[model samples]
Target: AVPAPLADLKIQHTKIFINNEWHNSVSGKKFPVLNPATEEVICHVEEGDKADVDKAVKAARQAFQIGSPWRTMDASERGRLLNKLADLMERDRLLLATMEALNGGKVFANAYLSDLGGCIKALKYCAGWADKIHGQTIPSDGDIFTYTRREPIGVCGQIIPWNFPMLMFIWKIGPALSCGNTVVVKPAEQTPLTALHLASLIKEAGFPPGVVNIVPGYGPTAGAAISSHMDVDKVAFTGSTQVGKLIKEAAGKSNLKRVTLELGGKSPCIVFADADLDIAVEFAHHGVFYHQGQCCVAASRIFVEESVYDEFVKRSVERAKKYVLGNPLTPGINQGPQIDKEQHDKILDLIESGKKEGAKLECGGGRWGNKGFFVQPTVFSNVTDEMRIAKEEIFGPVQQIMKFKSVDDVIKRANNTTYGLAAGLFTKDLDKAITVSSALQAGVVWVNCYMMLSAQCPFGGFKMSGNGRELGEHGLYEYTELKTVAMKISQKNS
Candidate 1:
């Protein structure tokens, strides 16, 4: 029997959303989206191609032109639209959470409290900034007045990932719409149900036609079209770093449209010898194992002082057993199935390489059961810098623990990765904490907490992890362009 909150929820839409209406793909083709937990096909959605993406982009361009409804709308009224959308989403939060768990295999409890609730909060946060966006006055000489104004960058092409599907969708559109820009979005082919459902709420929120469009398709065709489209003034992508580089290349080869990328990471959770062992163990487990380690900022790597490495390893192994791994729909299960078989196979292959390369698998390195795409919560100790498990992003519930001699050595080792998205440290000494935090090469450094995010703080990367900021005032800049306005006053007037 279905739960009461989810009893009325149904698969909402299965077609392309463009110009405030749903339509079949021009190619008359479709693809299957699977329920990762049951390994069953949820439904088939329209497979949008370059032709479909072109249509969406054209609609967005029209909406951005002067005298259009979206272009001429007041900034405060634009804010009202975003607030209305947030309110509507919150009203149907249970339905949205149910759909997200069905499609992406995230645990129901975590998905509702963190992912769905987080999206609502993000929409409200960006909505408040709509009317606050303004220009700056500049001091000038020689009877000339100069100022700077931030304006929308026309159409934005956004490609989101399967992980955190609902939150990523809101993250892309919240600031773009608040800044008065139109968007053509291509959701990850693996997870499109929630994004498609959100489209209904967008229409309900009374947005002007063409202000937002959702196209569900494969990456090579629809994603490439959005990246290379000349009409789009900006492109925002959240996915693997390799794909981000391809999008950057496509943008440069086309019209050099603005690009913002939030990509992958293998962040480290550094534990100092002076920290409390109990708290360190708990946080380290939470940092890597949360959400089945599907997050981009998963602390896949754990660095500990060599003096206490053995004790930390023992506690982490014992803690791994407590996580219930099974059906995500269940209330108590924290670890769910991987997104699909491909990801399952990839994670297992990496675990095998960890064994072959001389790292010790402490516990739970094999498949959990015979059915579905579930991987056991894996932990490895004595991991060397050169080992593949330590260097690469497993993107599964795998933790690699490496021992370090001193703070200096650990700081050097943490910055060695090409990714610099997020990192964590546990320490009691104030001087050491401040020094290490300043020296780390990550964008957000968690002093005592792990995976803590605020809508006010800027979030992004510093290196190969990708570029640009999201979720704060800095995020607004991603969708806007700064223009310098200069005028010369007449001598008589002066």
Candidate 2:
């Protein structure tokens, strides 16, 4: 049953959004979009391929032309339109949240109240910065005056991930459009409904035609097209590092479009002996298990001081048992189904490997039920650095806990992986926090928290996790091009 508050808000489906209108793909093909909770098809959405991507990119390029309405709009007016979008999204908040739960299989409460709310906040924040995109004057020794201008870099191609679909959509488009750039977005194949619906809201919010386009299809066609399109000035992607590397190669092969990638991570969460056990246990649990452990910044690798290792494992296993895993729409359910069967099976495989590799299985570690794609919240103890569960990015609700002798040992182990998106530490000792945090190679270091995100902070990776940032003033710069304007003042007089 539809929630009473969202009774008036309808969930529409089955189309590609292009040039401010809805239509079938050019090839008249469509694919089934499934509800992960029920393992049933919700609707058949248009299956866009290279042809559709070409059309969408063409429209975006046209919209980016100098005299186009979108191109000529004042910076403050762009802010107004973005702010209007933020308002409309909040008005339709319940409906969008329901769609996220239905399509992406996230817990309804968290999807609507937390993730969706964060999306609105991000949009509004980006909206406020529209007129603030300015460059500065430079110091020159000669008689020439030089300054720089931060200008939109034509059309942008953005590819978002399936996990947190709506949030990733906002993260990509908000900054791109706020800086006066048109976009061709490719939402993850598993969860395209929210992005398509968001496009409708963009049109209703008075955005000019072709200012934003959503093409939903497989990576080989739609995603590849976006990454390689000659007309695109830049391509910003948030997904796996493997795919991110492919996009980098595509850029190198094609127009050499500027690229920004936010990719995978196997982040570390360190717990010291001096930390409060209660707080550390809770935050450590929250680090790996939130969003079914699909988050890139998830602290899947836990390093506990040997003194508190036994106690932390016991508390973590006990806490893992309390999670309610079931249908995402269930009122009290905190954990929900994985995005699809492939992910669910992969998690199960990793769990089996964990058991085989001599890691002690502390709690739940298998399928939750006979139906859907749910996995039990699992915890592994006595984990070694060589174990697959400890080394790889599981991207599921499986936690691997290891013991460390000292801070130096943990820091070395934490930085052992090629991935470095985020890391966390828990300790009452301020000096240890600062010293260890400075030694970590990750992009964002949280002293007493995990998975902390804000609109003001720059979010990305430090190494193979991928390049460039997604939020903050730095995020706005990603969609823009910098040009130096130099002129001779007073006819080059000495």
Candidate 3:
């Protein structure tokens, strides 16, 4: 059945949320939020610029001060608050999923079953660690006492992308809050409704005012302000590689706020002859087409051994053709529109480039409908390593399948990219799985599966596909500072 009708979905809290209060932008400017399925303006949210960011940062700084409520709060109480937030999220899960589908153009079922659920899971996971985060004593060679303490890094500036708004928001704030750090968040301009809605939950969950602030506006203004603000002691961003570089540079140019980035990826998926062909085909299709292929860990590059290449291509094309594209809120519709026109056009352009570069278009290669930003689930065979579709992070529902001769050759080809967020291989042979997984240069390697992520496992990239890890204990590390304490003890006991 279809989800609850949009007539019942209400938009609340459109203004910038700072210090647990709603306020209009200092510039009195607002940006229109759009419904991607219909290409209509859903509502306008307050546009936050440098001044708004400064105000939010100031509030965050004050909240993070030594004697502030958030600072002096017990660690377990912090965990309780996070659990309370998760409880509120669970209470409003349906509404949150509907908002995500409306504002982000994600399938309602997936938004509810995957994205929102993941947010709750991540928050709960992080909450369990709040009281458990600690430092240890180190043994030294001399007659000295040495110990280390893990402390919060003060105010953090978090910038989340539009693709997975709720998930990214929770991913950033979960760890930061668990470590007792206050934050000023800049949700992506394109999709800010859910994040704004979550702001109310934060307030209701009893988080102290100014502990979490959200400013929604254009990237160059609100985002740039947060990255370069001197008071923000740390910045955590998840977006494109190009933008990550800019944020890093801005951080360095200002006060050098510690930065952690989870950026774009052109993830590779390798299918060997020995793998179960049916499983490989289904997983590869889902890996590249999930979320309309907007995920940074999308398996955009598929390499199949020559023996199974033809059959794999046939199966993949059929899978792509089966997708029913429509409004994400509609039942039985597995595919939805792109985030906006810019991404739609970009995907089409890359499809054209793939054809121009002599790759065989096995299936769709154009837009699906004229009304909205819906592109067909396109698949390309005989794709070469040099093709744009294979080389670049298309970040759309486009899959490129190339052939590989050997394990070494596929490993070499997969590692020859500027991005290395994740990679996957399908092989039943244990030896091959271990050998190739070790050789793959990506940060995460999946054998016999793809797009498998967990809250306990650390996630990030190896090279230019961003820095540092998110989720698990490693995510908590990104928001903390280690202070080493050492003291020399005299021989006399006095």
State the lDDT of candidate 3 residue by residue for 402-487, as single tens digits: 99988788889999999889998999999999988999989899888888787888886889988998897887877889999998
Ranking by TM-score: 3, 1, 2
List, residue by residue over 445-470, the lDDT tens digit for candidate 2: 99888777999898768889889988
The ten-residue window of minimal lDDT in model 2 covers 1-10
Candidate 2 Cα lDDT to native: 0.89
Q: What does the lDDT read for residue 279 in candidate 1?
A: 86
Query: Quick one: RMSD of model 2?
Result: 1.9
Clashes per model (N, Cα, C within 3 A): 0, 0, 0
lDDT string, candidate 1, 310-337, tens digits: 9999999999988888888877788999
lDDT of 1: 0.90
